[PDB]
Design a protein around this ligand. Structure first.
Ligand code: CLA
Ligand code: CLA
Ligand code: CLA
Ligand code: CLA
Ligand code: CLA
Ligand code: CLA
Ligand code: CLA
Ligand code: LHG
Ligand code: LHG
Ligand code: LUT
Ligand code: PQN
Ligand code: SF4
Lengths: 741, 87, 241, 41, 86, 157
């Protein structure tokens, strides 16, 4: 009772005694490295704190310190980004010409002819073209000078040192107790208002006193070296008033509830800025202020040290109906004592959020000169899509882990979890049927179109000319959003994004955003996406639901979460554990995300990105998506074969690296096949023969070489498969977009 | 009810017989949500012969009115059968 | 809980508003032993249960006393130059004698007539304060130390006492004020109250300087001339002008 | 100090340091003696 | 600004929740509601708060009720001046 | 306080549950009144009804989607296509009956949900399936034939 700061003093001594004893955290790794399997086991269980100790307090302390270390690593990475943008970039020159100078923040040394990678980006600078979008972010923040980037890099280094010190201090000096970690009410109250709300309010303040004036002058047209410094605008209401007249009144309108006076810098316009092609910074300021107020208000719902507030346990236990028996009872105990359940929920929502971010960012470019940078747009979208997919797969994996280790039947009786586990057969069977139906009605349509096209019967295909499959619902929603301003949003001057419809927003002769028409090809690709997502969900859900027991193996929970099988009996139990379900879900997630990014790339290159010549829009691919994306042959020829000429012809130029990785990735992927179609027995016997050869020359090692375990073989195969495929797509996308963008 | 085991009690007619009393209130613009929906229903064909074209005022009005009616119906049924939210 | 009646009675005798902000959790450890103990701790920071790091009753009380003394010096230093300049005693204009224009914040103004530039002055300041603060910290860690190692003969007055916040030896208590324990407790209460008032005053001076762009004495005089007009609400229109 | 030197002598640390030293030596050899197609002595 | 319609609305909208919570009409730090949310439960003093008010109206009650009243008053004032009235 | 989900016939150790989708009064009545769940009706008549419905509903797809859908003679071609599909599913029914019913065995009894003993469905027999298959052929072919007539008649269409 009573939320407070409870901490234990000096729990772990600081020394290098355990650094010289690898495998000290695990009890099973104490007999020493008798075989090579010990080396792999040392790394496969380094972060599995649940196995290193049975105490939840120690596990929580380890997680907290690991989080601090991760924060320090991220800060080091950020510092490196800012330092490279301040010392090995053309940001200052790019500011004067953001439409012709290609951003670059990496310079290579001349050693073995690699200096060819230093492309002629522009502004008297040579380097590698970057697609992270840091230049646009810095411009939106009003960096302008390189000294500010250097200062930010130094500050990031200081923050990294602070994070590492915090982790060491919280693990060896002042370690929080278990009751401190279980304060979900206090944690939520602080993360909602003190973190998200306060951060949004602070960013809004910076945007008001730094981003708005500097960016306004830049857009109006003023040399970056002539714009006043940020402090000259943050501490001088006269100049800022010269740029925004509502500031001549100070803070009086805010406290008198006459907020309308602030309508000059707190607008609700919409669309994009015609000069930069991005969202109106005033709109973003207003958005951040509104969400900050909302988050601050939301950070006052849970009860802590006072009577006011709500109880998570009380709210959960009060939500029970006639179809769910007991209801949400027991969920609070699960989420307050199991780290894997929280990790699963957080990973799922985190990945979904990343995907939503990718969508909202290409639809509504939030940074200046970002939409016209096709390379940056495609790179950001694809990167966030992959991060989201990986996080979702991890969420499923941790859900299965919790179901295998932290599940307790005595605490989950007749509740949501128990009832779900009591009818897993119906869920899995229905999901399997919907997956089969989607696969048929989605892929068979493409196969039918291919067969008709090959048979000389284009009138029997599922296209916009023959049997039409118009997405009436999507088109209706799109038109509804287009007609929203002045009707279902009277205070809105334009739609959220030009994709809903309207005019074409072009910046510097290139189309920044334009309406995206949906046809039969869009209908087909959307159903393909739904089918792939459903199959991935089926695999992950099946693993989570059958991780404990199954009709084939009634004691699967006893075998653990990660085991290769249960022998060749019962016909075969290969890949029956939850870990194997995650292993297969990774492949399906890769397939789904790959199709998603391919669809996005082709659609933007055929119906969005292009040039304006006062006579129309000349798209990159000429709009061949609407007439070729309805068949697999079109995707293979008009997209894979047609757009791959940029990466296979990059030798001898700056993009040659993309041509090398493109091949290297192809190798790694194929390499994975060796570990995916093979078994452990063959390699063990081959190693036996090689060991005999070594013994014949008295060069056999004491650490008996052993073939990788079945689980390790599967992990290596899946890791190499995804690395090769993702890297191949990365090289192809980057080379193509950097050569035609 | 006469058939099934539908918990939709007959006394629960207040859902659908009370939602119009609130949706008919004018919203400054136009004249009223239900009024506009009914006018569109009676003008843009008797929702059976030809059709409401593609993305018309009738479509959004019908979707919004049905959204409100359905949410009121289900929430009221849950509340009434829950007996002062005894769950 | 419902408080403890007897424990709340002690806080009630303190008078003022010290009762509407007290709680049963704070009264479990705030028994009036420390000077200035008025039973105010809604967040329960000085709770001895689970204490560690810098969030400990000893460190928190020591930090409060240190802040009190530093704030008293700061408030006196914030008001003395402006008051002396307003009366013409020193050859500095009232707008130039403001505390935030001495050189602490060059953007807000600086006095460029010192015997040496402010950065080098800060270098000397860092060395001197490093010596003083490090010796004080080591005494806090080990009370018996600081009086053993040779320090030009000054170590003889660094023995300290049981309480780190009250060394009061041959130098820190020259006049030997507060000879009896009750008198010392009363004087400690005076010091704590004055330091708290000085802390509040320093924060107020900073806020007024940011919102009025003038000095504390000037703000007080302008408020006295016209209180209804010159105040927080009346100055909302012009904050950094 | 003994434990630190023992940790520095572990297989991963020694492997990374050896690879870094060999790579650095090769890079400098190619920097001072570039385009060595054949062994011209 | 003092004595204006906006000032009167804000003052009233902030003071009303305070008097409501003091006379057992609004939830406070001692009296809460059951799972229904419309039935005030008897005053419980498990939070350890102390106040000189005869009814036990603590300072946390002042802060909570004042914040809620301020939010409601701000919304009411903005809606009134953004609709033509006020 | 009501629990709409109960174990099948009160037994909680049978791989089935009773939900408002399976044990619904109207749903149960409609599902029980289908020709497939008529233990007392002759299998031939039930097969005739099933074949009629299936044959009638099977013309439409080829009519509006067949290779010759854009020709005036699409109705006839589709009638023939449905006849062929009915004959195919007919041989399917015969093969299933010849493989499933080829031996005898003292099977366990059959009771209702209340516990009233009932004989096994005559359809689950060598002669029962043959009669059902024969009725499906006559009904299936008749349904396809009626599908063509409806195209010629039906003033709206
Ligand atoms: C010089 C400071 C120092 C020292 C001497 C120690 C010493 C010790 N720590 Mg500790 N720790 C420190 C700082 C330090 N720590 C900091 C800054 C943090 C916050 C992150 C932690 C958090 C921490 C935790 C949570 C735990 C320990 C534990 C331990 C004990 C055994 C584990 C161990 O060290 O194995 C050796 C570790 C290493 C040799 C290095 C670990 C791997 C690093 C962190 C990876 C960095 C990533 C890097 C960028 C590479 C990734 C990318 C790459 C592929 C390119 C040991 C006595 C463990 C313990 O008490 O045992 C039960 C325990 O669980 N520490
Ligand atoms: C307003 C209070 C506050 C704030 C701002 C934070 C902020 C944060 N918490 Mg935290 N937390 C709080 C209260 C707060 N917490 C309380 C009261 C509890 C106890 C119930 C916890 C328990 C808790 C746990 C168990 C964990 C966190 C974690 C995190 C980090 C998540 C990383 C991230 O995505 O954010 C973005 C990252 C940044 C913005 C980096 C900037 C960091 C700055 C310095 C913010 C530091 C705020 C800090 C609370 C200041 C007080 C520390 C002070 C004594 C020096 C984040 C920085 C997680 C973590 O990663 O551990 C570090 C995590 O494991 N918190
Ligand atoms: C955290 C975000 C943030 C920050 C740091 C600032 C900071 C500042 N704003 Mg600002 N503002 C913000 C958000 C923010 N604003 C938002 C979201 C809006 C939209 C409503 C505005 C609209 C706005 C206007 C119209 C004006 C300012 C002005 C100012 C400057 C003087 C105002 C002031 O009170 O001094 C600093 C404020 C603080 C130090 C906050 C401290 C919090 C309390 C009051 C003190 C501590 C608590 C206390 C002890 C109890 C100042 C540098 C004025 C200016 O001079 O223009 C340049 C001006 O006219 N702001
Ligand atoms: C916040 C994210 C997060 C966190 C904290 C964890 C934490 C944990 N996971 Mg998990 N996981 C996640 C996300 C996360 N995971 C995601 C997104 C996935 C989907 C891929 C998974 C899938 C997963 C599985 C299948 C398993 C775990 C397991 C575990 C536990 C042991 C991890 C370990 O020590 O193994 C060792 C860690 C390593 C060996 C690091 C190796 C890094 C990979 C193999 C290399 C990738 C290359 C990289 C991209 C760079 C390429 C360049 C290269 C050429 C140099 C641990 C508690 C294991 C467990 O038993 O749970 C209890 C388990 O088997 N996770
Ligand atoms: C980001 C996650 C995080 C979390 C959840 C915690 C949580 C905790 N820390 Mg810790 N700490 C962190 C990060 C974090 N810390 C970092 C990054 C550092 C290195 C700087 C430290 C260094 C540190 C020390 C040295 C100590 C703690 C202590 C504590 C414990 C009590 C702190 C407290 O509430 O007292 C009160 C909190 C404060 C007084 C903080 C106020 C001062 C800071 C500077 C406010 C500014 C933060 C804000 C984001 C700045 C915004 C910018 C500004 C311009 C407005 C507590 C459990 C103490 C402890 O061990 O308790 C037993 C302890 O002594 N922390
Ligand atoms: C009004 C504020 C105030 C008050 C009431 C106290 C009270 C006390 N202080 Mg403290 N002190 C203060 C401010 C204050 N101090 C400030 C601002 C600092 C920072 C420099 C210190 C630093 C300090 C230290 C380091 C120590 C004390 C100690 C003490 C205790 C010893 C008794 C005493 O001397 O009484 C105080 C008497 C007065 C406040 C009246 C004097 C008021 C005039 C204006 C001061 C003039 C001083 C002037 C420079 C004299 C120069 C010549 C002089 C030597 C003859 C006592 C309870 C000692 C202790 O704890 O004893 C065990 C001790 O170790 N104080
Ligand atoms: C005297 C009482 C009064 C009056 C006359 C008004 C009048 C008005 N209010 Mg207001 N309001 C009041 C009290 C009042 N309010 C109170 C007490 C609060 C709480 C503090 C609010 C909070 C509030 C907010 C947050 C907003 C308004 C808004 C509005 C204006 C448009 C309302 C509208 O059509 O929304 C829109 C109608 C819709 C159908 C939109 C609904 C779609 C949402 C986004 C769905 C989201 C779902 C998702 C799950 C969450 C309008 C002039 C809106 C405005 O534009 O401000 C001018 C607005 O943003 N009010
Ligand atoms: C296209 C829509 C995207 C979602 C995919 C839908 C397919 C999923 C079908 C699986 C159903 C499984 C039945 C579980 C059976 C089940 O969960 O038990 C019944 C469930 C339990 O409720 P209780 O009465 O127990 O409530 C107490 C709760 O607090 C505890 O759970 O109540 C429901 O009816 C949930 C609604 C399920 C139906 C969801 C459909 C919602 C319609 C959304 C339409 C969106 C588009 C139209 C908007 C205009
Ligand atoms: C988020 C940032 C905010 C930080 C808040 C957290 C800090 C908590 C500090 C609160 C004090 C704790 C309890 C003190 C308890 C307490 O008050 O102690 C009582 C106080 C101090 O007196 P003593 O300590 O000497 O008490 C002993 C004697 O009073 C015996 O009876 O006396 C007063 O009444 C002065 C206080 C008046 C308040 C001054 C405000 C004057 C401004 C008037 C403005 C009028 C118009 C306003 C319009 C805007
Ligand atoms: C009690 C409690 C309990 C619960 O539970 C919790 C809580 C809430 C946390 C609490 C509260 C707290 C508080 C109130 C705090 C505050 C503080 C302050 C204000 C400080 C200041 C403080 C302040 C200070 C130190 C100050 C100082 C000052 C100074 C040095 C100054 C200096 C100077 C001078 C002379 C002059 C020149 O020309 C400038 C300079 C150089 C600058
Ligand atoms: C090749 C192969 C092996 C043999 C592979 C072994 C024994 C691993 C060899 C690793 C050597 C010792 C290190 C090679 C170092 C490389 C230059 C880089 C490796 C990357 C590491 C740093 C992680 C298996 O054991 C196996 C098991 C199950 C299914 C498939 C297979 C399989 O395909
Ligand atoms: S083939 Fe391998 S995984 Fe499959 S049952 Fe045999 S040992 Fe197990």
């Amino acid at each position: 009772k009573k939320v407070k700061i409870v901490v234990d003093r000096n729990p772990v001594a600081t020394n290098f005694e355990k650094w010289a004893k690898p495998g000290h955290f695990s009890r099973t790794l104490s007999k020493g490295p008798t075989t090579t399997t010990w080396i792999w086991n040392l790394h496969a269980d380094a972060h599995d704190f649940d196995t290193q100790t049975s105490d939840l307090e120690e596990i929580s302390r380890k997680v907290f310190s690991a989080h601090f270390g991760q924060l320090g690593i991220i800060f080091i990475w950020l510092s490196g980004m800012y330092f490279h943008g301040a010392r090995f970039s053309n940001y200052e020159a790019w500011l004067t010409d953001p439409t012709h100078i290609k951003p670059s923040a990496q310079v290579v040394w001349p050693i073995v002819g690699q200096e060819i990678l230093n492309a002629d980006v522009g502004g008297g600078f040579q380097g590698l073209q970057i697609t992270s979008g840091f230049f646009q972010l810095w411009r939106a923040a009003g960096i302008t000078s390189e000294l500010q980037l250097y200062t930010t890099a130094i500050g990031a280094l200081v923050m990294a040192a602070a994070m590492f010190f915090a982790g060491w201090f919280h693990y060896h000096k002042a370690a929080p107790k278990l009751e401190w970690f279980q304060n979900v009410e206090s944690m939520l109250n602080h993360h909602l208002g003190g973190l998200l709300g306060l951060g949004s309010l602070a960013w809004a303040g910076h945007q008001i006193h730094v981003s708005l004036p500097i960016n306004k002058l830049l857009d109006a047209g003023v040399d970056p070296k002539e714009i006043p410094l940020p402090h000259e605008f943050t501490l001088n209401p006269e100049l800022m008033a010269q740029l925004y007249p509502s500031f001549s009144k100070g803070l009086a309108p805010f406290f008198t509830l006459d907020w309308a006076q602030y309508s000059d810098f707190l607008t609700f316009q919409g669309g994009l800025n015609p000069v930069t092609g991005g969202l109106w910074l005033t709109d973003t300021v207003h958005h951040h202020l509104a969400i900050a107020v909302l988050f601050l208000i939301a950070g006052h719902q849970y009860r802590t040290n006072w009577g006011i507030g709500s109880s998570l346990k009380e709210i959960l236990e009060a939500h029970k109906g006639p179809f769910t028996g007991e209801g949400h009872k027991g969920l609070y105990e699960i989420l307050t004592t199991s780290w894997h359940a929280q990790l699963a929920i957080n990973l799922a929502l985190f990945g979904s959020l990343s995907i939503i971010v990718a969508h909202h960012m290409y639809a509504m470019p939030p940074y200046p000169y970002l939409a016209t940078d096709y390379g940056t747009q495609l790179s950001l979208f694809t990167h966030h899509m992959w991060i989201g997919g990986f996080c979702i797969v991890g969420a499923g994996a941790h859900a299965a882990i919790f179901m295998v280790r932290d599940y307790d039947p005595t605490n989950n009786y007749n509740n949501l979890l128990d009832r779900v586990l009591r009818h897993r057969d119906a869920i899995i069977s229905h999901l399997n049927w919907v997956c089969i139906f989607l696969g048929f009605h989605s892929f068979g349509l493409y196969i039918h179109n291919d067969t008709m096209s090959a048979l000389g019967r284009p009138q029997d295909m599922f296209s916009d000319t023959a049997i039409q499959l118009q997405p009436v619902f999507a088109q209706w929603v799109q038109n509804t959003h287009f007609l929203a301003p002045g009707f279902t949003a009277p205070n809105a001057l334009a739609s959220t994004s030009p994709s809903w419809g309207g005019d074409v927003v072009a910046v510097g002769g290139k189309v920044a955003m334009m309406p995206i028409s949906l046809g039969t090809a869009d209908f087909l690709v959307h159903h393909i996406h739904a089918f792939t997502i459903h199959v991935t969900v089926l695999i992950l859900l099946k693993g989570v639901l059958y991780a404990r027991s199954s009709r084939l193996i009634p004691d699967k929970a006893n075998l653990g979460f990660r085991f290769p099988c249960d022998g060749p009996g019962r016909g075969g139990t290969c890949q029956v554990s939850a870990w194997d379900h995650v292993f297969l879900g990774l492949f399906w997630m890769y397939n789904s995300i790959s199709i998603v990014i391919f669809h996005f790339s082709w659609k933007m290159q055929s119906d969005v990105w292009g040039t304006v010549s006062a006579n129309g829009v000349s798209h990159i691919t000429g709009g061949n998506f609407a007439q070729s994306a309805n068949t697999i042959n079109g995707w293979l020829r008009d997209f894979l074969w047609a757009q791959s000429s940029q990466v296979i012809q990059s030798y001898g130029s700056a993009l040659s690296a993309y041509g090398l990785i493109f091949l290297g990735a192809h190798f790694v992927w194929a390499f994975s096949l060796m570990f995916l179609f093979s078994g452990r027995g063959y390699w063990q016997e081959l190693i036996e023969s090689i060991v005999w050869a070594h013994n014949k020359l008295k060069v056999a090692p004491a650490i008996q070489p052993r073939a990788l375990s079945i689980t390790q073989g599967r992990a290596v195969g899946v890791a190499h498969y995804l690395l090769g495929g993702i890297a191949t797509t990365w090289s192809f996308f980057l080379a193509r977009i950097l050569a035609v963008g | 009810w006469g058939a099934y085991e539908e918990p939709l009690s007959l006394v629960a007619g207040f859902l659908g017989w009370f939602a119009p009393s609130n949706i008919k209130v004018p919203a400054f613009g136009n004249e009223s949500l239900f009024g506009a929906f009914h006018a569109s229903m009676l003008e843009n064909l008797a929702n059976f012969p030809q059709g409401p074209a593609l993305t018309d005022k009738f479509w959004i009005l019908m979707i919004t009115w049905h959204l409100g009616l359905f949410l009121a119906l289900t929430l009221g049924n849950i509340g009434q059968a829950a007996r002062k939210q005894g769950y | 809980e419902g408080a403890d009646l007897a424990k709340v009675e002690r806080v009630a005798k303190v008078g003022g508003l010290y009762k509407n902000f007290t709680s049963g959790q704070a009264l479990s450890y705030l028994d009036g032993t420390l000077p200035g103990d008025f039973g105010f701790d809604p967040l329960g920071l000085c709770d001895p249960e689970g204490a560690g790091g810098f969030i400990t009753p000893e460190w928190l009380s020591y930090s409060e006393v240190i802040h009190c003394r530093w704030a008293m010096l700061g408030a006196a230093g914030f008001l003395a130059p402006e008051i002396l300049a307003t009366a013409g005693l020193i050859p500095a204009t009232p707008e130039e004698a403001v505390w935030f224009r001495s050189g602490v914040i060059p953007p807000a103004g600086q006095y460029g007539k010192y015997w040496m530039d402010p950065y080098s002055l800060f270098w000397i300041e860092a060395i001197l304060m490093n010596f003083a603060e490090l010796k004080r910290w080591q005494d806090f860690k080990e009370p018996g130390s600081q009086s053993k190692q040779y320090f030009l003969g000054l170590e003889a007055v660094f023995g300290g006492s049981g309480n780190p916040a009250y060394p009061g030896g041959q130098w820190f208590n020259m006049l030997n004020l507060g000879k009896t324990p009750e008198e010392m407790k009363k004087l400690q209460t005076n010091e704590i109250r004055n330091g708290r008032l000085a802390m509040i005053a320093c924060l107020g001076c900073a806020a007024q300087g940011v919102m009025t762009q003038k000095g504390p004495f000037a703000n007080l005089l302008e408020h006295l001339a016209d209180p209804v007009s010159n105040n927080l609400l009346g100055n909302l229109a012009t904050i950094l002008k | 100090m003994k434990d630190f030197t023992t940790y520095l002598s572990t297989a991963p640390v020694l492997t990374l340091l050896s690879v870094t030293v060999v790579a650095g030596l090769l890079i400098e050899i190619n920097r001072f003696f570039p385009d060595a197609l054949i062994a011209a002595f | 600004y003092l004595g204006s319609t906006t000032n009167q609305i804000m003052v009233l909208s902030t003071f009303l929740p305070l008097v409501a919570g003091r006379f057992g009409l609004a939830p406070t730090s001692t009296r809460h509601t059951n799972q229904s949310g419309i039935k005030l439960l008897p005053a419980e003093k498990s939070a350890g708060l102390v106040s000189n008010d005869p009814a036990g109206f603590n300072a946390v009650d002042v802060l909570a009720l004042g914040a809620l009243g301020h939010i409601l008053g701000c919304g009411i004032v903005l809606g009134l001046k953004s609709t033509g009235n006020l | 306080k009501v629990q709409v989900v109960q174990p099948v016939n009160g037994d909680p150790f049978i791989g089935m549950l009773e939900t408002p989708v399976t044990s619904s009064p109207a749903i149960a009545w409609y599902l029980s009144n289908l020709p497939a769940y008529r233990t007392g009706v002759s299998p031939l008549l039930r097969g005739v009804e099933i074949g009629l419905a299936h044959g009638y509903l099977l013309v439409g797809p080829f009519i509006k989607l067949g290779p010759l859908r854009d020709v005036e003679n699409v109705a006839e071609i589709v009638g023939c296509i449905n006849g062929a599909a009915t004959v195919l599913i007919l041989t399917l029914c015969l093969a299933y009956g010849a493989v499933t019913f080829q031996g005898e065995g003292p099977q366990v009894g059959v009771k209702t949900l209340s516990g009233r003993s009932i004989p096994r469905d005559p359809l689950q027999s060598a002669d029962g399936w043959n009669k059902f298959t024969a009725g499906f052929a006559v009904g299936g072919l008749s349904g396809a034939a009626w599908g063509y007539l409806c195209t010629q008649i039906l003033p709206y269409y």
